[PDB]
Design a protein around this nucleic acid. Structure first.
Ligand SMILES: [Mg+2]
Ligand SMILES: [Mg+2]
Ligand SMILES: [Mg+2]
Ligand SMILES: [Mg+2]
Ligand SMILES: [Mg+2]
Ligand SMILES: [Mg+2]
Ligand SMILES: [Mg+2]
Ligand SMILES: [Mg+2]
Ligand SMILES: [Mg+2]
Ligand SMILES: [Mg+2]
Ligand SMILES: [Mg+2]
Ligand SMILES: [Mg+2]
Ligand SMILES: [Mg+2]
Ligand SMILES: [Mg+2]
Ligand SMILES: [Mg+2]
Ligand SMILES: [Mg+2]
Ligand SMILES: [Mg+2]
Ligand SMILES: [Mg+2]
Ligand SMILES: [Mg+2]
Ligand SMILES: [Mg+2]
Ligand SMILES: [Mg+2]
Ligand SMILES: [Mg+2]
Ligand SMILES: [Mg+2]
Ligand SMILES: [Mg+2]
Ligand SMILES: [Mg+2]
Ligand SMILES: [Mg+2]
Ligand SMILES: [Mg+2]
Ligand SMILES: [Mg+2]
Ligand SMILES: [Mg+2]
Ligand SMILES: [Mg+2]
Ligand SMILES: [Mg+2]
Ligand SMILES: [Mg+2]
Ligand SMILES: [Mg+2]
Ligand SMILES: [Mg+2]
Ligand SMILES: [Mg+2]
Ligand SMILES: [Mg+2]
Ligand SMILES: [Mg+2]
Ligand SMILES: [Mg+2]
Ligand SMILES: [Mg+2]
Ligand SMILES: [Mg+2]
Ligand SMILES: [Mg+2]
Ligand SMILES: [Mg+2]
Ligand SMILES: [Mg+2]
Ligand SMILES: [Mg+2]
Ligand SMILES: [Mg+2]
Ligand SMILES: [Mg+2]
Ligand SMILES: [Mg+2]
Ligand SMILES: [Mg+2]
Ligand SMILES: [Mg+2]
Ligand SMILES: [Mg+2]
Ligand SMILES: [Mg+2]
Ligand SMILES: [Mg+2]
Ligand SMILES: [Mg+2]
Ligand SMILES: [Mg+2]
Ligand SMILES: [Mg+2]
Ligand SMILES: [Mg+2]
Ligand SMILES: [Mg+2]
Ligand SMILES: [Mg+2]
Ligand SMILES: [Mg+2]
Ligand SMILES: [Mg+2]
Ligand SMILES: [Mg+2]
Ligand SMILES: [Mg+2]
Lengths: 190, 57, 76, 137
RNA sequence: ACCAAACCGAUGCAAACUCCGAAUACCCAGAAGUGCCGAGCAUGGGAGACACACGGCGGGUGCUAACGUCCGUCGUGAAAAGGGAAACAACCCAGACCGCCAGCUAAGGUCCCAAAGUUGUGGUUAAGUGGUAAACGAUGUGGGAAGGCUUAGACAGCUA
RNA sequence: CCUAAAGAGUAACGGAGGAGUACGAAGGUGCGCUCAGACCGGUCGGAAAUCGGUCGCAGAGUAUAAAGGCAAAAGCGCGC
RNA sequence: CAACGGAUAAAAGGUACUCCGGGGAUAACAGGCUGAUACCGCCCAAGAGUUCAUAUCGACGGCGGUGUUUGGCACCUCGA
RNA sequence: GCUUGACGAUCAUAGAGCGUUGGAACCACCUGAUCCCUUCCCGAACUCAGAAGUGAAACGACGCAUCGCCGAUGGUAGUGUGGGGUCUCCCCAUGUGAGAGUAGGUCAUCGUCAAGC
């Protein structure tokens, strides 16, 4: 499932990283977090890009196998080529059982077709945001947060306070007194 | 202790900074070899003009 | 065109850099306003020129509140 | 067309267009986007021409964003005029494009309808483009 | 059911914006060696010159047009022959005191004109591509990572 | 002021603006004090006059363009 | 004395009736470089064509070619 | 060493916000305007004479990261020298290397003197 193999990287810099991408088909990467000194690793380009196609590739914990050592890890950030779109770099956050981790989690809009604002009012559905930033312990990190639009009329706004998170999950942005909009129903363009 | 240094390329058209690095080692013309002590001051002129020289060691 | 005007340059800036030996009356900075402030042993002219009142070397330090930049003279 | 309501200065130096677009290279609002893969500049008549060719093909719902704004004035010297005698007058407004910049966005349509409509828009633009999808990171 | 300052969040741009911020280049001091035997400075005798050109890098202007024009900084020509780029001031290699029917190399080259590999190993091209060219178009051909159907009968054909 | 390439300097019939003054106090010194703006309450004003309170930190001011400065304020007032 | 290092205290024009010394250091003709413009092709396809995008055309936009017009420059020729 | 004052060092990892707490001394509020001194009016502020009251306000001490402020590692951008390309822009070798963001820190640390134990 979510398993990666990586090797230790000892050659650093602009020149060494360019030779990894050009002549070896590898990707530089870093593992930090927990309570340890950070470590520099390297991994296959065609291996990381295959896992990224999975929907829950950023809201799931991954078993990283560096050398023979196995440790549990979550994907924190990801650098991509601005034009071609492939991954150039990635950093990995170590996972500890009792410590809060702050991650991005995708949303799921269900039963959009039965929306009250759609069938009767004839209005469109617009998703203002498609992912939300959460914070929780690893044991209760969800693969997605599910938002329904069954009881939504025309002109109605869905906010962060409206949707409900699983037990032990906190919405970060809502804590800072900012409930940004999630979705709405509006009149047709024409 | 010391190090072989040999001038293999011409000095014509080089940067004035690089001409003084070759002259500071005692090199006069192509295929001419000198003895210079391996000190950080002498190494710095060798590195600045690395492409004009052959360092046998 | 109605643009072809300009004024002659004034040759401002730092005249003596940090660590240089100085003598009394030496001009250190030419300024508009006070980018640098007169530290110990340094006087200020009416066009904000910084000059040396004693002998020593330039120090240049950012200290105090307001984050000001000071030029002072210290004994070598 | 598109141009600033007012500007601090009437003219600008030509400058240079270098680098990649690290900022503005994500699908920030919609689900699909048209992204530039070569460097050039759009003249605010190609932007309007490509917008009308894009919204017409949909004609049923959907939200459309434009992420490029022409804010650089360019001059032109009239015919039969010698060199010098001051800078020329402003004729049109342009936007600098670096490789990897998102040009248009759309949501509320199928992937195939967006893919067909962005093909029509790309035929009015003087630079290479590509079709991309929104991702978390 | 129109418009809506302001505020919150997301998201771009700036030679005459800056919460930031290099590499280089400039000053200063202390040191080893080299310097053609000097390099620096001062004071006097004699000048010439004050129409520059191209190439690279950083810019304004022009159309990021011109063997255009105007600046900064290097190199060459001017005032520099020799070899190479077919011929070709300014490009690359290299700075001619004289002589030799001696040798080694640089850039560039090794089938013939014409000096030197019809050299060796593995592949690609069929277009004289090589030996001029853009949007766009195409079952050309080689390589790679993956997919939708299908022996419970996939696609093309035939027998009603 | 930009061009001007983070020391100085640097051209174009390049891009933008000002000057050919003012002040016997608008100078010296000692002492003393902080603006713009917002909100609330308050008679004719009501958005804005003078007033009281809270926040505010320079978004004000500087004789005159722009740039660089200004808490020991270089800003404001009074006596000599 | 602003033509702001200020020729004198004191100064405007015509020459197709013209003249001399010079210059391709500098224009007009032709040549050269360039190709904004010009001309000729191609790409997209809203639309016109009773219906039907491409029989025939083709808006808004894009990419080239030729030196072929109007230009830009001032490299050759002012002892023709 | 424990508490309070005065003067410094250094200028947010030191600030802001919220809460608890301090009166024996010190300090602050406090009483009065006769006497020095004062208000472009007012003992409000400055000043004088004080010892009835309080720690309310102010100030200090102590806790908390919500804000503010610091902030890696790695990667990316740029860049000196030499060399290349399909040369408006890039790549290679070598040296250098941000800004932003991420993990994460921060409710400061000192010096001299005088008073209470
Ligand atoms: Mg490099
Ligand atoms: Mg050379
Ligand atoms: Mg001008
Ligand atoms: Mg100038
Ligand atoms: Mg200047
Ligand atoms: Mg004085
Ligand atoms: Mg320019
Ligand atoms: Mg940018
Ligand atoms: Mg700038
Ligand atoms: Mg000699
Ligand atoms: Mg002259
Ligand atoms: Mg002279
Ligand atoms: Mg001259
Ligand atoms: Mg000249
Ligand atoms: Mg010149
Ligand atoms: Mg020249
Ligand atoms: Mg140039
Ligand atoms: Mg130029
Ligand atoms: Mg040119
Ligand atoms: Mg020229
Ligand atoms: Mg040059
Ligand atoms: Mg030169
Ligand atoms: Mg020479
Ligand atoms: Mg000459
Ligand atoms: Mg020659
Ligand atoms: Mg030759
Ligand atoms: Mg020859
Ligand atoms: Mg040739
Ligand atoms: Mg060779
Ligand atoms: Mg032969
Ligand atoms: Mg053979
Ligand atoms: Mg072969
Ligand atoms: Mg051929
Ligand atoms: Mg051919
Ligand atoms: Mg400068
Ligand atoms: Mg410089
Ligand atoms: Mg000059
Ligand atoms: Mg004027
Ligand atoms: Mg004043
Ligand atoms: Mg100012
Ligand atoms: Mg003060
Ligand atoms: Mg004159
Ligand atoms: Mg004059
Ligand atoms: Mg004169
Ligand atoms: Mg006359
Ligand atoms: Mg004559
Ligand atoms: Mg004559
Ligand atoms: Mg000529
Ligand atoms: Mg002339
Ligand atoms: Mg003719
Ligand atoms: Mg002509
Ligand atoms: Mg053309
Ligand atoms: Mg029709
Ligand atoms: Mg041509
Ligand atoms: Mg012709
Ligand atoms: Mg010329
Ligand atoms: Mg001729
Ligand atoms: Mg003639
Ligand atoms: Mg003749
Ligand atoms: Mg780093
Ligand atoms: Mg950093
Ligand atoms: Mg920061």
């Amino acid at each position: 499932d979510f398993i990666l193999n990586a090797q230790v990287r000892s050659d650093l810099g602009k020149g060494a990283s360019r030779r990894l991408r050009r002549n070896a088909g590898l990707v530089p990467a870093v593992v930090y977090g927990g309570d340890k000194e950070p470590q520099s690793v390297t991994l296959e380009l065609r291996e990381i890009a295959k896992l990224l196609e999975n929907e829950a590739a950023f809201s799931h914990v991954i078993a990283l196998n560096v050398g023979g050592a196995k440790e549990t890890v979550l994907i924190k950030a990801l650098q991509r080529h601005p034009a071609k779109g492939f991954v150039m770099h990635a950093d990995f956050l170590r996972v500890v059982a009792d410590h809060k981790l702050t991650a991005h989690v995708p949303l799921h809009f269900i039963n959009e077709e039965v929306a009250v604002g759609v069938k009767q009012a004839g209005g469109e559905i617009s998703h203002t945001i498609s992912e939300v930033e959460v914070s929780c312990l690893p044991k209760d990190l969800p693969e997605f947060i599910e938002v329904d639009m069954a009881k939504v009329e025309l002109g109605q706004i869905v906010h962060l306070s409206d949707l409900k998170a699983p037990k032990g999950v906190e919405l970060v942005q809502l804590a800072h007194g900012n409930d940004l909009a999630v979705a709405n129903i509006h009149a047709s363009r024409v | 202790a010391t190090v072989k240094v040999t001038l293999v390329k011409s000095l014509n058209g080089r940067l004035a900074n690089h001409k003084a690095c070759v002259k500071g080692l005692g090199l006069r013309r192509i295929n001419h070899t000198v003895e210079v002590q391996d000190t950080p001051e002498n190494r710095g002129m060798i590195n600045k003009a690395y492409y004009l020289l052959r360092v046998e060691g | 065109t109605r643009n072809g005007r300009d004024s002659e340059s004034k040759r401002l800036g730092v005249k003596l850099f940090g660590g240089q030996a100085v003598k009394a009356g030496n001009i250190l900075v030419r300024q508009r306003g006070t980018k640098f402030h007169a530290g110990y042993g340094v006087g200020l002219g009416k066009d904000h020129t910084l000059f040396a009142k004693v002998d020593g070397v330039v120090k240049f330090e950012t200290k105090g509140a307001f984050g000001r930049k000071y030029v002072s003279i210290v004994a070598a | 067309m598109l141009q600033p309501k007012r500007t601090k200065f009437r003219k600008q130096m030509t400058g240079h267009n270098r680098g990649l677009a690290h900022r503005g290279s994500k699908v920030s609002f919609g689900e699909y986007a048209l992204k530039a893969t070569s460097r050039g500049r759009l003249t605010a008549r190609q932007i309007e021409s490509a917008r009308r060719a894009l919204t017409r093909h949909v004609k049923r719902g959907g939200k459309i964003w434009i992420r490029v704004f022409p804010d650089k004035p360019v001059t032109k010297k009239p015919l039969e005029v010698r060199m010098g005698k001051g800078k020329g007058g402003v004729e049109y407004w342009v936007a600098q494009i670096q490789p990897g910049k998102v040009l248009y966005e759309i949501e509320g349509v199928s992937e195939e309808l967006a893919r067909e409509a962005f093909a029509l828009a790309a035929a009015k633009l003087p630079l290479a483009t590509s079709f991309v999808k929104r991702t978390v990171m």
